[model samples]
Target: MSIEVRDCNGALLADGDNVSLIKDLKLKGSSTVLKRGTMIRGIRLTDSEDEIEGRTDKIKGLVLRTEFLKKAGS
Candidate 1:
């Protein structure tokens, strides 16, 4: 299935979500580099895509860049 994150309610990413960053984030409290093309998986959302979170095979549970993201579908 494919999920479309409306500009309003684009939160709550699914388990396997393919998305990029909306901007260059400096990761929570660390200097860890979170490049742009960082493919994300297992996305978890709170209220909006603004609060969208995801994890990759490499990176841990970190927030994503909602602006430069492209959902691969649900």
Candidate 2:
């Protein structure tokens, strides 16, 4: 069965969908952090329904919570 990946607003998220952070998030063991409204491209749906993964221009391998993302905004 295919996994259903949904974002914070309950919208369906596909393999290549983009999302943005609704608030600042700090990495568990890193110096850099994500700011609100920071757009993230190429969202990869994970095994967990509440989690997604992606990378930034500099940062790689981000584990983002569904509730932390505001999916697909202009």
Candidate 3:
């Protein structure tokens, strides 16, 4: 389960509080890589507690790791 993040801008990203990738992913149709540490913001709650849609740097909107986040909520 992941918690959503807010940037104080009120821009909603994911449906839930937080989200994580199911597996390693590479940007579609591009050499850009997301790796794992990508942080998304402005997440909203979803119907399920384990999923969310958010935006990242250069990655735009995507589902990210909820369990892999830092304790301080970076």
Candidate 4:
């Protein structure tokens, strides 16, 4: 069965789509605080319903929860 992933606003999210942070995310085990409205590109949905993987300019492996993201502009 395919897992459904939805953003903070309850909108569906798909791979290769850009997303923006709805709030400041303080990374665990790191000092970098991803500010609100930080745009993330090319998101990959995880097997879980609430998790997704994304990449930033400085970070290669970033995992963010759906509760913090929203689909960006087309």
Candidate 5:
């Protein structure tokens, strides 16, 4: 079954789509803190609707909640 993933703004999310954080939260397993406005590129939609795997410049393999993510515009 295919699950449709939507971001905080209720926008449809897909693989390879760029997104940004809507809330400030620190990353676990390491001390790299991420801010609300931080950009996350190339997000991969997982089986769960709310959980998306993305990466930033300094962080990789970041599984973030969709509640804190929003689609990024050009």
Candidate 6:
């Protein structure tokens, strides 16, 4: 079954879409912190409705919750 994924602004999200972080996110087990307003490109939608995967220059396999993101304008 397909789950509906939405961003912080309640906009639907899909694979390859760009998103921006709404707030600073601290890495759970590390000291790295993703600052707010970070633009994340080429996001991959996951099976879950509330999760997506993206990567930063400094990190790979970055999994983020939809609640913290918003769709980026083209």
Q: What overall lDDT goes with each candidate model?
A: 0.57, 0.78, 0.45, 0.80, 0.85, 0.83
Off by over 4 Å in 4: none
Worst 10 residues of 6 by lDDT: 54-63
Best by lDDT: 5
**Cα lDDT of model 1 by residue, 1-74, tens digit:** 33434322254345455566544556555676666655676676545535557777777786654555656444
Candidate 5: count the clashes.
Answer: 0
Q: Which 10-residue window in model 3 sums to the lowest lDDT?
A: 4-13
Candidates in order, TM-scores: namely 0.52, 0.80, 0.41, 0.85, 0.85, 0.85
Give candidate 3 regions above 4 Å deviation: 1-24, 27-32, 63-74
Model 3 over residues 22-66: C-alpha lDDT tens digits?
334566665665565445555555444344446665656555434
Q: How many backbone clashes are present in model 3?
A: 15
Tens digits of lDDT, candidate 5, 3-74: 788888888888898899888888565676778899998998987898899998887877878888989984
Best to worst by lDDT, what's the order? 5, 6, 4, 2, 1, 3
Model 4, 1-74: lDDT tens per residue?
A: 77778888877787876788889888666587889888887888888779888877777567778788988784
Clashing pairs in 2: none
**TM-score of model 5 vs. true structure:** 0.85
Q: Model 6, 30: alpha-carbon shift in Å?
A: 3.4
For model 5, name the residue pairs that clash. none
**Which is better, 3 or 6, measured by TM-score?**
6
